[PDB]
Enzyme design. Structure first.
Site, short mmCIF file in Angstrom:
data_model
loop_
_atom_site.label_atom_id
_atom_site.label_comp_id
_atom_site.label_asym_id
_atom_site.label_seq_id
_atom_site.Cartn_x
_atom_site.Cartn_y
_atom_site.Cartn_z
N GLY A 25 78.16 -20.89 13.56
CA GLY A 25 76.55 -19.94 13.43
C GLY A 25 76.28 -19.13 14.49
O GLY A 25 76.93 -19.54 15.61
N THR A 26 74.57 -19.28 14.73
CA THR A 26 73.52 -18.85 15.63
C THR A 26 73.26 -19.78 17.10
O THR A 26 73.58 -20.63 16.28
CB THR A 26 72.53 -17.59 15.44
OG1 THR A 26 71.93 -19.36 15.67
CG2 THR A 26 72.94 -16.70 14.40
N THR A 27 72.87 -19.62 17.85
CA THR A 27 73.31 -20.82 19.03
C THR A 27 71.78 -20.81 19.03
O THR A 27 70.61 -20.65 18.66
CB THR A 27 73.33 -19.90 20.39
OG1 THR A 27 74.37 -19.33 20.22
CG2 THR A 27 72.83 -20.63 21.44
N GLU A 54 68.66 -18.44 18.01
CA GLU A 54 69.56 -16.91 18.69
C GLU A 54 68.81 -16.48 17.09
O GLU A 54 69.49 -17.19 15.64
CB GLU A 54 70.84 -16.78 18.85
CG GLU A 54 71.44 -15.65 18.44
CD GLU A 54 72.56 -15.60 19.17
OE1 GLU A 54 73.32 -14.66 19.43
OE2 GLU A 54 73.08 -16.69 18.53
#
Ligand SMILES: *C(=O)[C@H]1NC[C@@](C)(O)[C@](O)([C@H](CC2CCCCC2)NC(=O)[C@H](CCCC)NC(=O)[C@@H]2CC(F)(F)CN2C(=O)[C@H](C)NC(=O)CN=[N+]=N)O[C@@H]1C
Ligand SMILES: [Cl-]
Ligand SMILES: [Cl-]
Ligand SMILES: [Mg+2]
Ligand SMILES: [Mg+2]
Ligand SMILES: [Mg+2]
Lengths: 226, 244, 250, 195, 241, 195, 243, 125, 204
Positions: free
Chosen positions: G29-31, G46
């Site tokens: 996934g995104t941070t 993010e």
């Protein structure tokens, strides 16, 4: 019905009259109202006779199983709680009025319970048609630091008050004495003050007195071999 | 999910056979032999208890012969515990029919019902069939003496003499040889024991390995008696016939 | 969620075996030895209190359990399976008998009910069989003293004497030599203690042996007096001390 | 409703049942058969609430006809009556009980004996030499108590019923537009077409 | 070979899923220990905060079940918390229904029977945890009862759980083989904790600071956990003798 | 007769001791003050059964809350009572006062009448006896009274309610909820009647 | 083998491989991050700009529970929304009975027990999210992180998704260089910096920063999104630190 | 309840459980029906591998559904009883609601409906 | 309307020296109308006798039910149910319908096969047991039956004297109730022989 429970120095005593009635008629002249929930927890009942007997047996059973599952002598507070939640669930329709008394690891206990699920603590209690007659004697003669002998006397006197002055109560006085560290002692027909006198006449008739239309033999036995 | 572990106990083979039925039948072929023999004046049930001990209490023991009502008994071949589930269900049909019509259940109606239950476990539910075959010995006032069998498949059939459990092939051949229609219960008893005597996997047939029961009109007048023979009585009937 | 295991986990193999029952019997074989001897005037059931750790208080693990005042059970195999069976067994003596007839069930019928719960676990969706064999000793007024064995399958049989688990084969052969139909209870206790010594490796005293009897009524164990027809329970667990006294006459 | 009589004679059972169907102040029909054949040797007459009568009659019929096909056999009158009673006794503690009273007249081909059963909507069953439901019984029971004999022929049975219908046409307030009469004997069920 | 995936018998008569649940028990790599005093029951556990980003105050495997019962869990926290929430519910339900505080051993039995069900029922997995229940019971006195994924439970004079249990168990056995009594003969719980920590030191061959341990104490009515400062007082005392 | 008063040091709860069945006194020394937590009490009025069944359930809900989220606020105890009393209003005859001492908000009093509404008040009176002391309580209550003043205000108030109400009598029990903990006070006829 | 084909099956290691695979979906996934400050918490995530067709500031990822709790996740977005929907039910049922808004530790265990329940049966898939949530209750600020297993802990700072190692380093520095603690306005800047720094591991597509915060002083203990000038001031401070 | 799809399609559009059911019917004893100008005759094989049977009480292969309709079969006998019981019930249900016995086509269509349902219901073969 | 007095009728039971007696009238009415002169109210399961008064449909249903229950009892226990145990089975069975009861006044009588002890018992409609030593009464003429019994009855009567006493108690009770009579049956029960007698009484 007249039931009482009286706490004393080293335990609790429970007493009841021995008359059961269908309306104004007496069904059982020597009925037993003193029932056993567990070996050292006894109660006595008024109201719907079936209802009180069902509810004692159901809570006696579940208390026996609980005692086995926990490996402990059963407690009165447990019988109390189970009874009140059952009676409350049924909204008064289970007409069970009980004085519950026991000895357990926690000590001696005395509780009342009413059909709607209300409970009551005290050093002396009464219940039934005879309850006001019993409570008059208890309020007149009860003291702190009763001995076993004084508490039985006070319990039976309180039942006697019911026997004589209440039409709903009669016959004999049943007692159970639950003392700490001792076996419960159930004194069935403790007092016996209402024995019927000898009748003036035997009504044993002469055989042949009744007119018979047909005789026959009834087989109670199962079907026989050969 | 769960599907990964499902045996699928109620499916057809490519041949058109029911796996679990055929395998439960295999199970029953290793159970003690049970014999039913129907005579003109009664029915004999006889069954062999599986390799017992000297320390098995034989007089309070019942693995083979169960009473369904006062007119009908069964001989069991297969899993005893499975049989006790069905017997208790059959006992309740018998008491429901008697409550509803105020007449003892006709034997073939009770047998059809137990056979219909069995059939259920082979078409729906996803459970294993009952590893049990029954010999029903019964009397009703429509057909008189009746011998039936039912098996895991829930199929049932009537018989003059029949075997279930172990060595049925061997037992069926000996019965087919010595049965006659005009036979009497005493003759049938003797046939029943001679059969087991030769088809037994044991060295000798003794009382402590047998369960025995006769449904006779040998009851005083127009009525029927069930006799679940006691150890001592089996021992007497083994000497009379001359097998010990 | 929902239990989506609505199908039997015990099925017939092509050989006509029920694998899960056979495997259950294997778990029972590994189990510690327990036995039962029936006398003329009583029954004894005994087992070894195999203590997992010496720190563990083996008193707080009841391998021998009161089912009714006149019936006890002992086992071999999986202790947890046994425990929940004793729970269900005690409750079913009430719901399916005592709350209907107002008396405790006779030994053969309580056994019958334990048997039924064990059968259902061989056929019901989403469960394995119970990994125990029970010996159940009891007395009722119309059948006298009795001793039954109950297997994972649900099958049950009556015994004069028997043993299950680890050292059963040997223990059964030992009982066959000693058992006659004239034995007094004390004689059957003396034989139960001999038979149990063969299967135990380490200590052999009243703190490593659990032994209960079905004998005479114990009024002293009733809890109350004043009803003559209530004479107290026939089941009695022997004390550590009571076992040790009998080990000096061994 | 109101008029169903049964009399068991030597070798038959006779069911007599009123032809009137009255709703409010109109007699809607004067030719109503208040009967259903349950099997070739068992006839059931019925009286009670509108709708319930036939729904109960037809329901029982369908069950007995089902039993007959399944077993290729005819249940005894005793068995049919016990079935019927239990149905009523189950109904009486239902949300809406069947308000229907029945007579069951049957010839038992096994015992060669006619049998009359009287069952009320509570499931109260009795075997009687003669029976009636509702007000009729108030006249016909004392009448039959005097005139009945067990060993009467079917012809005597029919004369004895004529006595009962006349007494009812004299002393009952409502016009029940006569009775349909049916004989249950060893040869089955037939309607007496002149009464 | 699906008799290894669900809780059915292997041909040897074994449940592999129970056995693999026992292994899950040591995943946290913590050792717990429980001993009894005269009036008290003391449970100590290793506390390991690897991440500096963690709020150390929240990292605990010791649970206050009721007022009298404390529970320490050897196993993964998600299963531990599942067991904690069930024991709380059950000790609350029991009090409402039967009018007295659930005894330590009874809740042990109840959690054990629940575990026994996951071993007989296929849709339910065993929990990867060993539950050590401690109290001063009003009938039995200082009490230690321990449950595992097999649905086994028993009472203990003392006990230890985790990777190095065999070494803690033996160290403790040795001490009772000397004293010849079932408990730590000591009037205060502070000295039963000192004994607890001292005997875990000698058995793991490791020293401890205040943030390397977790301590629970059960007295006659109340079970409490110690603060870092409470343990530092206990560590100082040890060092000074 | 039951009341709660919030003062400087904490809160005081007071009750009579009479349980009656019609005009008969079933118990003349009952305790109507029941602990929900360590320093959270209720005073019960209405049905003996209904109040007890409720109080038992609220005990259980807070015992469970304590196990999960630590000490609940007196407001939270009141909410549990309100929720039960409002959802079961068609089958409950229960009038409840809830008094508590936390260390943040100090003394708080909540009242729950028949409807199952909640009212946060400096002091609350309730039960049959309360009607006779609305005037006296209103003219005598001050905010920021001492313990000695508040116990006195409540002694006098309930003293009057007992005198005038047949459905109230016995001893006056109180419970003092301060930082220091819980103190139990009893006052007997001879002490309060001569006020 | 076969131990990884069915959820709630222990491997011989004593592990649940379906849970360990969920973690992979997470790591993919995104941070997203959490920073506990003096009187509150700051969340940040993010949001990869796949295309110029994405309407800036519209696809909001951070979700409110009740009025005082922030939740942000990494992994399967729908799994996270399913968990917040349950959370809202738990926070509604707790308020209904007890009147007080749910305390954060209590809220965390409500999510914990629910996720943990999805590792108990083979009929459900574990959650494909690590979730970072927290807020202000009666006992002050709390920050929590919760994993597909049901595991959760209190955190001074939290990070999950593809840039977690990078973020965890930047967090570890702040904990060391601020023992007395960070201010909410400070934590908003730092949050922006740690998302820009953690974007190096997703550096293919350009991203859209999103911050939210609960602070006793700065928002009255209510969850609010960081918008307009305070966001621009944070994006400015962030762009300055990477250059 | 046991929900398992036992009758499913195979890659070549076949329902094997339905086809393996036809295989059970192939195995069954033979059955024939010949309709004349004013009659129908049902004829049924009885395998002579079973002797010592009782032919009075053994279930006969031809079953009366109503007084005017009969049903013979090939296949599993235990299965055939369920179909005969369901048909005999519907036969009485039709009389009770339509005041008319079923047509042979109506009874057939009913039994065929019951067989079809057991090919796309979960839990059943 | 009052279900316990639509059909009418009475049962009485008495203990004697190593014997019991149970007796019942034969009437079944619909209130004023007499319907049947042959409605017996005393049934038997092995050696245990049950009399039942009240709503006749329930009399029949309970007899059908207890036949059912004692049949299964015997198949599982391999012995005949004893009077004490059956009494518990009646009480259990009635109490199961606490809020929809069977409108009945059951009476159990019989001799314990093992103790030889004569036993009687009665029940209200919800299964409350009355276990008098002396005598049990039930039905529309209960008041009367109590009066006759309490004056006539003496303990330890021989079977042939007891027969006279219970016959005279029932007959004179029934002649004073509009809804009882129309015939009567008396069972004299000894440990292993049972005599059934039909009484000549007035038919009004
Ligand atoms: C002050 O205002 C007090 N006045 C008296 C009161 C009645 O308002 C009461 O609420 C008391 C105190 C209860 C005691 C138990 C703990 C909660 C507080 N309420 C009662 O005593 C209650 C009143 C009923 C009507 C308000 N009494 C009963 O419930 C009694 C108890 C019982 F067992 F006996 C049965 N019962 C009955 O009322 C039932 C309904 N019985 C009858 O109506 C006929 N007799 N019977 N059985 O305290 C106030 C605070
Ligand atoms: Cl009440
Ligand atoms: Cl449990
Ligand atoms: Mg009638
Ligand atoms: Mg009369
Ligand atoms: Mg008259």
């Amino acid at each position: 019905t007249t039931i009482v429970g009286v706490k004393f120095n080293n335990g609790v005593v429970i007493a009841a009259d021995t008359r059961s009635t269908q309306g104004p008629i007496v069904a059982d002249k020597n009925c037993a109202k003193l029932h056993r929930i567990s070996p050292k927890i006894w109660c006595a009942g008024a109201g719907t006779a079936a209802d009180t007997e069902a509810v004692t047996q159901l809570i006696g059973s579940n208390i026996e199983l609980h005692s086995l599952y926990t490996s402990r002598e059963p407690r009165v507070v447990s019988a109390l709680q189970m009874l009140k939640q059952h009676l409350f669930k049924y909204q008064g329709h289970i007409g069970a009025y009980l004085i519950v008394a026991g000895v357990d690891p926690t000590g001696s206990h005395l509780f009342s319970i009413h059909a709607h699920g209300s409970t009551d603590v005290g050093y002396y209690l009464s219940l039934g048609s005879g309850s006001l007659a019993a409570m008059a004697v208890l309020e007149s003669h009860w003291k702190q630091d009763l001995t076993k002998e004084e508490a039985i006397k006070l319990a039976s006197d309180a039942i006697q008050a019911g026997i004589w002055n209440d039409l709903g109560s009669g016959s004999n006085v049943d007692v159970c004495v639950m003392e700490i560290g001792k076996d419960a002692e159930y004194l069935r027909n403790y007092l016996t003050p209402n024995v019927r006198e000898e009748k003036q006449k035997s009504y044993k008739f002469p055989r042949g007195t009744t007119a018979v239309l047909k005789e026959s033999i009834v087989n109670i036995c199962d079907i026989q071999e050969e | 999910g769960s599907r990964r572990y499902d045996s699928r106990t109620t499916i057809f083979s490519p041949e058109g056979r029911l796996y679990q039925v055929e395998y439960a039948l295999e199970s029953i072929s290793h159970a003690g032999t049970a014999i039913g023999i129907m005579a003109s004046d009664g029915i004999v049930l006889a069954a062999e208890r599986k390799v017992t001990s000297t320390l098995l209490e034989q007089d309070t023991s019942t693995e083979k012969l169960y009473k369904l009502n006062d007119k009908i008994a069964v001989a069991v071949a297969g899993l005893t515990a499975d049989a006790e589930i069905l017997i208790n269900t059959a006992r309740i049909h018998a008491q429901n029919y008697l409550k509803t019509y105020n007449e003892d259940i006709p034997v073939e109606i009770l047998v059809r019902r137990l056979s219909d239950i069995k059939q259920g476990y082979t078409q729906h539910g996803g459970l294993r069939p009952f590893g049990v075959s029954f010999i029903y010995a019964g009397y009703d006032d429509r057909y008189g003496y009746q011998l039936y069998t039912s098996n895991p498949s829930g199929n049932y059939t009537g018989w003059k003499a029949i075997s279930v459990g172990a060595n049925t092939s061997a037992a069926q051949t000996l019965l087919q040889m010595d049965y006659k229609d005009d036979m009497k219960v005493d003759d049938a008893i003797e046939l029943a024991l001679k059969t087991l005597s030769k088809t037994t996997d044991s060295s000798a047939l003794t009382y402590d390995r047998l369960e025995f029961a006769t449904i006779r009109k040998g009851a005083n007048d127009g009525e029927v008696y069930q006799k679940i023979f006691k150890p001592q009585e089996i021992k007497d009937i083994l000497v009379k016939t001359g097998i010990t | 969620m929902t239990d989506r295991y609505s199908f039997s986990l015990t099925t017939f193999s092509p050989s006509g075996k029920l694998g899960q029952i056979d495997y259950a019997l294997t778990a029972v074989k590994q189990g510690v030895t327990s036995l039962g001897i029936k006398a003329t005037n009583g029954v004894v059931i005994a087992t070894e209190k195999k203590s997992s750790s010496p720190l563990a208080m083996s008193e707080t693990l009841s391998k021998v359990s009161l089912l009714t005042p006149d019936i006890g059970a002992v086992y071999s195999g999986m202790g947890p399976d046994y425990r929940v069976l004793v729970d269900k067994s005690r409750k079913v003596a009430h719901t399916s008998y005592k709350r209907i007839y107002g008396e405790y069930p006779p030994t053969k019928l309580l056994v019958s009910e334990v048997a039924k719960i064990m059968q259902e676990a061989t056929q019901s969706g989403g469960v394995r069989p119970f990994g125990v064999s029970l010996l159940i000793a009891g007395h009722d007024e119309f059948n006298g003293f009795s001793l039954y064995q109950v297997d994972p399958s649900g099958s049950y049989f009556p015994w004069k004497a028997t043993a299950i688990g680890k050292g059963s084969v040997a223990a059964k052969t030992f009982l066959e030599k000693r058992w006659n139909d004239e034995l007094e209870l004390e004689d059957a206790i003396h034989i139960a203690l001999l038979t149990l010594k063969e299967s135990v490796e380490g200590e052999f005293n009243g703190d490593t042996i659990e032994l209960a009897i079905i004998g005479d009524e114990n009024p002293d164990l009733l809890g109350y007096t004043g009803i003559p027809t209530d004479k107290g329970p026939r089941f009695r667990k022997l004390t550590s001390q009571e076992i040790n006294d009998r080990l000096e006459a061994l | 409703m109101d008029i169903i009589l049964g009399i068991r004679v030597q070798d038959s059972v006779i069911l007599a049942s009123s032809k009137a169907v009255t709703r409010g102040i109109s007699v809607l029909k004067d030719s109503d058969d208040k009967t259903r054949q349950l099997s070739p040797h068992t006839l059931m007459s019925f009286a009670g609430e509108a709708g319930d009568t036939v729904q109960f009659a037809e329901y029982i019929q369908a069950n007995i006809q089902l039993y007959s096909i399944r077993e290729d056999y005819e249940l005894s009158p005793q068995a049919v009556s016990s079935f019927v009673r239990q149905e009523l006794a189950k109904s009486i503690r239902s949300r809406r009980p069947y308000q229907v009273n029945v007579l069951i007249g049957g010839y038992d081909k096994k015992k060669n004996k006619p049998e009359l059963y009287q069952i009320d909507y509570l499931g109260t069953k009795v075997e009687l030499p003669y029976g009636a439901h509702g007000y009729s019984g108030f006249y016909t029971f004392s009448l039959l108590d005097h005139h009945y004999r067990p060993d009467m022929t079917t012809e005597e049975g029919l004369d004895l019923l004529k006595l009962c219908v006349q007494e009812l046409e004299k002393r009952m307030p409502m016009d029940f537009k006569g009775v349909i009469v049916k004989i249950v004997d060893k040869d089955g069920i037939r309607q007496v077409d002149d009464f | 070979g699906y008799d290894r995936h669900i809780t059915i018998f292997s041909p040897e008569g074994r449940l592999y899923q129970v056995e693999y649940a026992f292994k899950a028990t040591n995943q946290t790599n913590i050792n717990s220990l429980a001993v009894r005093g005269k009036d008290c029951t003391v449970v100590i556990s290793q506390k390991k905060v690897p991440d500096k980003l963690l709020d150390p105050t929240t990292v605990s495997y010791i649970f206050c079940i009721s007022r009298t019962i404390g529970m320490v869990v050897n196993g993964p926290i998600p299963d531990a918390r599942n067991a904690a929430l069930r024991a709380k519910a059950e000790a609350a339900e029991f009090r409402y229904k039967y009018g007295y505080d659930m005894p330590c051993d009874v809740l042990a039995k109840r959690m054990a029977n629940l575990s026994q069900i996951y071993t007989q029922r296929a849709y339910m997995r065993p929990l990867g945890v060993i539950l050590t229940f401690v109290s001063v019971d009003e009938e039995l006195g200082p009490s230690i009862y321990k449950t595992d994924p097999a649905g086994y439970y028993v009472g203990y004079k003392a006990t230890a759980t985790g990777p190095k249990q065999q070494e803690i168990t033996t160290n403790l056995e040795n001490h009772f083989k000397k004293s010849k009594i079932d408990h730590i003969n000591e009037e205060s719980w502070e000295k039963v904790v000192e004994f607890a920590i001292t005997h875990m030191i000698d058995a793991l061959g490791t020293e401890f600071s205040k943030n390397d341990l977790e301590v629970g104490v059960a007295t006659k009515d109340k079970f409490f956990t110690l603060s870092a400062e409470n343990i530092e007082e206990r560590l100082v005392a040890i060092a000074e003798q | 007769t039951i009341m709660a008063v919030e003062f400087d040091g904490g809160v005081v709860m007071g009750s009579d001791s009479r349980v009656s069945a019609g005009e008969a006194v079933v118990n003349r020394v009952f305790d109507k003050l029941s602990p929900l937590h360590e320093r959270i009490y209720c005073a019960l009025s209405g049905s003996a059964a209904d109040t007890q069944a409720i109080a038992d359930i609220v005990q259980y809900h807070l015992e469970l809350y304590t196990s999960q989220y630590g000490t609940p606020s007196t407001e939270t105890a009141a909410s549990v009572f309100k929720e039960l009393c409002y959802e079961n209003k068609d089958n409950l005859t229960a009038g409840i006062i809830v008094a508590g001492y936390d260390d943040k908000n100090k003394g708080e009093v909540y009242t729950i009448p028949l409807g199952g509404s909640v009212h946060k008040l400096p002091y609350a009176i309730a039960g049959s006896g309360s009607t006779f002391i609305y005037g006296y309580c209103d003219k005598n209550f001050r905010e920021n009274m001492s313990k000695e003043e508040t116990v006195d205000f409540i002694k006098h108030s309930l003293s009057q309610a007992i005198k005038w109400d047949g459905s109230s009598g016995g001893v006056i029990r109180m419970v003092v909820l301060t930082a220091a903990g819980v103190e139990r006070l009893i006052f007997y006829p001879d002490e309060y009647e001569q006020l | 083998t076969g131990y990884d084909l069915s959820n709630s099956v222990f491997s011989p290691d004593g592990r649940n491989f379906q849970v360990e695979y969920a973690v992979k979906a997470v790591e993919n996934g995104t941070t997203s991050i959490g920073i506990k400050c003096n009187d509150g918490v700051v969340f940040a995530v993010e949001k990869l700009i796949t295309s110029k067709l994405l309407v800036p500031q519209k696809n909001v990822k951070i979700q409110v529970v009740d009025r005082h709790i922030g939740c942000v996740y990494s992994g399967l977005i729908p799994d996270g929304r399913h968990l917040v929907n349950r959370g809202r039910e738990e926070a509604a049922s707790f308020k209904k009975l007890y009147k007080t808004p749910i305390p954060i530790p209590a809220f965390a265990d409500r999510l914990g027990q629910y996720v943990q329940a999805h590792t108990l049966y083979n009929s459900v898939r574990p959650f494909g999210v690590s979730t970072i949530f927290g807020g202000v209750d009666k006992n002050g600020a709390h920050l929590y992180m919760l994993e597909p297993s049901g595991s959760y802990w209190g955190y001074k700072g939290a990070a999950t998704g593809k840039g977690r190692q990078s973020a965890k380093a930047e967090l570890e520095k702040l904990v060391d260089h601020h023992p007395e603690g960070l201010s909410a306005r400070e934590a908003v800047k730092q949050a922006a910096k740690i998302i820009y720094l953690a974007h190096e591991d997703n550096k293919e597509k350009d991203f859209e920063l999103e911050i939210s915060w609960c602070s006793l002083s700065e928002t009255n203990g209510l969850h609010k999104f960081v918008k307009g000038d305070l966001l621009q001031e944070a994006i400015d401070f962030a762009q300055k630190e990477i250059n | 309840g046991y929900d398992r799809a036992l009758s499913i399609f195979s890659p070549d559009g076949h329902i094997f459980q339905v086809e393996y059911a036809l295989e059970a019917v192939k195995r069954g004893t033979c059955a024939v029906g010949v309709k004349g100008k004013n009659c129908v005759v049902l004829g049924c094989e009885r395998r002579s591998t079973l002797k010592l049977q009782d032919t009075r009480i053994t279930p006969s292969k031809v079953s009366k559904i109503d007084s005017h309709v009969v049903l013979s079969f090939s296949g599993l006998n235990a299965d055939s009883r369920i179909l005969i019981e369901k048909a005999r019930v519907e036969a009485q249900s039709h009389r009770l609601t339509l005041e008319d016995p079923v047509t042979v086509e109506y009874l057939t269509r009913y039994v065929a409906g019951v067989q079809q349902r057991y090919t796309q219901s979960g839990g059943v073969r | 309307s009052d279900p316990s007095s639509i059909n009418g009728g009475i049962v009485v039971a008495m203990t004697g020296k190593d014997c019991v007696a149970i007796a019942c009238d034969l009437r079944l009415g619909s209130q004023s109308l007499g319907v049947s002169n042959k409605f017996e109210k005393i049934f038997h399961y092995g050696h245990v006798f049950l009399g039942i008064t009240g709503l006749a449909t329930d009399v029949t249903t309970l007899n059908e039910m207890f036949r059912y229950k004692t049949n299964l009892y015997k198949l599982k226990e391999e012995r005949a149910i004893e009077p004490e145990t059956f009494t518990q089975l009646v009480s259990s069975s009635l109490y199961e319908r606490r809020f929809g009861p069977y409108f009945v006044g059951p009476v159990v009588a019989g001799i314990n096969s093992k103790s030889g002890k004569p036993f009687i018992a009665g029940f209200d409609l919800i299964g409350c047991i009355d276990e008098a030593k002396d005598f049990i009464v039930s039905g529309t003429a209960s008041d009367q039956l109590f009066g006759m019994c309490e004056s006539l009855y003496e303990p330890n009567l021989e079977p042939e004297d007891l027969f006279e006493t219970i016959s005279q108690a029932l007959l004179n009770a029934a002649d004073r109730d509009a809804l009882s009579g129309w015939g009567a049956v008396v069972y004299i029960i000894k440990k292993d022989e049972v005599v059934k007698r039909y009484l000549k009484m007035r038919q009004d």
